[model samples]
Target: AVAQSFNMQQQRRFYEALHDPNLNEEQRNAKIKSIRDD
Candidate 1:
């Protein structure tokens, strides 16, 4: 369903952010908050 696909995309984004060492603590937390807030 559309919702499921959206969730998958969000998860992908979350994990990608998680593995991105270039992201600072603030940036990582912000990215996580952004995704969770969606």
Candidate 2:
């Protein structure tokens, strides 16, 4: 129940980060990595 749509919120977070056109791969991956780190 914990990683449910509440998890979708996190997915949406990195999803936007995934689709962000300004930042490069390394920066995005790095940022998203720690953000979702568990």
Candidate 3:
């Protein structure tokens, strides 16, 4: 499924952002919101 692949990509990016330590809560939330909104 293309969406599954996209979801996996989002999962990877979310975890990457989570581990980055530079991204704040707002940034993380925004990223998630952007993904969800799309």
Candidate 4:
């Protein structure tokens, strides 16, 4: 249950970063990888 909550938060953060105009494709991919690796 605790881990699930954390995962949701990370997913939310990833989507937020994904739509940020300041982030490039490489940066977004890196962020995704970082989140998945967690």
Candidate 5:
């Protein structure tokens, strides 16, 4: 359906959040967890 699998979508967002440059370590980690929970 979409461009990639749901996991890939999550991973895309994961790396996006990972290299956001704005979110700190804790914030990045929290975003990672949030993506996992998505």
Candidate 6:
């Protein structure tokens, strides 16, 4: 359950970061890496 919650949070953050057009390639890549890492 704890892991699932963490995954959900990471996914939410990833999508939020992804949808932000202001984010640069590096930033988006970092977010995607973070989400994958989680």
Candidate topping TM-score: 6
Instruction: Estimate, for each residue in 1-38, the C-alpha lDDT of model 5 and write its tens digit.
Output: 44333666789879978999887889899878887666
Kindly report the root-mean-square deviation of model 1 from the true structure over all alpha carbons: 3.3
TM-score of 4: 0.61
Counting clashing residue pairs in each candidate, in order, gives 0, 0, 0, 0, 0, 0
Q: Where does candidate 2 stray beyond 4 Å?
A: 1-13
Model 6, residue pairs in steric clash: none
What TM-score fits each model? 0.64, 0.50, 0.52, 0.61, 0.51, 0.65
Which digits, one per residue and each the tens of the lDDT, describe model 1 over residues 1-38? Answer: 43343555788878878889888778888888888767
Error of 6 at 7 (Å): 1.8
Per-residue accuracy of model 3 over 1-38 as CA lDDT, tens digit each: 44443656688787866677689888988887776554
Q: Find the 10 residues in a row with the least total lDDT in model 2.
A: 1-10
What is the Cα-based TM-score of model 1? 0.64
Q: On TM-score, who's better, 3 or 5?
A: 3
Against the true structure, candidate 2 reaches a TM-score of 0.50
lDDT scores for all predictions? 0.77, 0.72, 0.71, 0.78, 0.79, 0.79
- Candidate 4 residue pairs that clash: none
**Preferred candidate (lDDT higher): 3 or 4:** 4
